[PDB]
Design a protein around this ligand. Structure first.
Ligand SMILES: OC[C@H]1O[C@@H](O[C@H]2[C@H](O)[C@H](O)[C@H](O[C@H]3[C@H](O)[C@H](O)[C@@H](O)O[C@@H]3CO)O[C@@H]2CO)[C@@H](O)[C@@H](O)[C@@H]1O
Length: 308
């Protein structure tokens, strides 16, 4: 039952700027095995692991995933399962697929055939997230077609694991009403990433064009709160109407935002998601949006309190 699987996910955290970089560590984070003890002890139920499989698979048929990398992902998944954490794995940063979905469709499906084959007998606490933030030439209508093709591939191999399906137009709420999950699939959770107000969460983010113009933006007024509730109500009404559980798989404010606003925004988002019984995963553990200092081995106490 996917709603029971959503309850199993519960509170989570992304270990980002790690396996979704071109190579692990390039973006600042290597997934240490002790991180799983740290995260479980703090109270989280699961970890979300962004993975850029596309740079670790051949470009020509059968698009085989490279041995060393598969072994590494196995090591990470098993490290998390050892502590009783549920685990979400995905395909992240496959830009070629977004820019030309027609050319990369079969390669994308070969990746899922291999990933489902690899993990089909792993525990039910492992979840498969089809694709992080479809966007660009992978339009909402093309994503509805591609996600159904992925579901068919995965289900041809594995009818046990819950699958997580995102929205197009970069994975937020804008294309939620356009999302179509096939009626025949009954064990999926829909995921939405929530970073609104984007100008607040992303102020000064170096990889976002013109974000410097947002530096200093605050968050916390009664009107800021009402706007966010309006958006969460929209998502909740969609969930109720379409009978699909919701997972906010990524949300967080960048370190350049003032700490007090980050705490208020993060704490309010978590209280409001929990009132709607949604599962979620904070973005992210220890990098630019981080809440844990790997050198001092300490959590930012106020941001951790906002989460747990
Ligand atoms: O850290 C250095 C490294 O940063 C690269 O930019 C990345 C950011 O650091 C974050 O990792 C960012 O995370 C996004 C996720 O991938 C999802 O889209 C979503 O959850 O939102 C978060 C937050 O925006 O991703 C960017 C890359 O897109 C990049 O600049 C790299 O060259 C640099 O070395």
């Amino acid at each position: 039952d996917p709603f029971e699987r959503n309850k199993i996910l519960g509170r989570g955290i992304n270990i980002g700027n790690a396996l979704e970089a071109p190579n692990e560590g390039d973006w600042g984070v290597v997934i240490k095995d002790e991180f799983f003890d740290i995260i479980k002890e703090a109270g989280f139920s699961h970890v979300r692991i962004p993975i850029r499989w596309s740079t670790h698979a051949y470009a020509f048929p059968p698009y085989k995933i490279m041995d060393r990398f598969f072994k590494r992902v196995d090591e990470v998944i098993n490290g998390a399962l050892k502590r009783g954490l549920a685990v979400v794995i995905n395909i992240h940063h496959y830009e070629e697929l977004m820019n030309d979905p027609e050319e990369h469709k079969e390669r994308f499906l070969a990746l899922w055939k291999q990933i489902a084959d690899r993990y089909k007998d792993y525990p039910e606490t492992l979840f498969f997230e089809i694709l992080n933030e479809p966007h660009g030439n992978l339009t909402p209508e093309k994503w509805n077609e591609l996600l159904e093709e992925a579901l068919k591939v995965i289900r041809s191999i594995d009818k046990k694991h819950t699958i997580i399906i995102g929205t197009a137009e970069w994975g937020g709420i804008s294309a939620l009403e356009k999302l179509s999950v096939p009626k025949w699939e009954k064990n999926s959770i829909v995921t939405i990433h929530y970073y609104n107000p984007f100008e607040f969460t992303h102020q000064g983010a170096e990889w976002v064009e013109g974000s410097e113009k947002w530096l200093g933006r605050k968050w916390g007024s009664p009107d800021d709160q009402k706007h966010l509730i309006e958006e969460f109500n929209f998502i909740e009404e969609w969930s109720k109407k379409n009978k699909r559980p919701i997972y906010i798989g990524a949300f967080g404010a960048y370190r350049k935002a003032d700490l007090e606003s980050r705490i208020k925004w993060t704490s309010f988002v978590v209280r409001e998601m929990e009132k709607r019984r949604w599962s979620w995963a904070y973005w992210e553990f220890c990098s630019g949006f981080g809440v844990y200092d790997t050198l001092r081995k300490t959590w930012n106490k106020d941001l951790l309190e906002a989460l747990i």
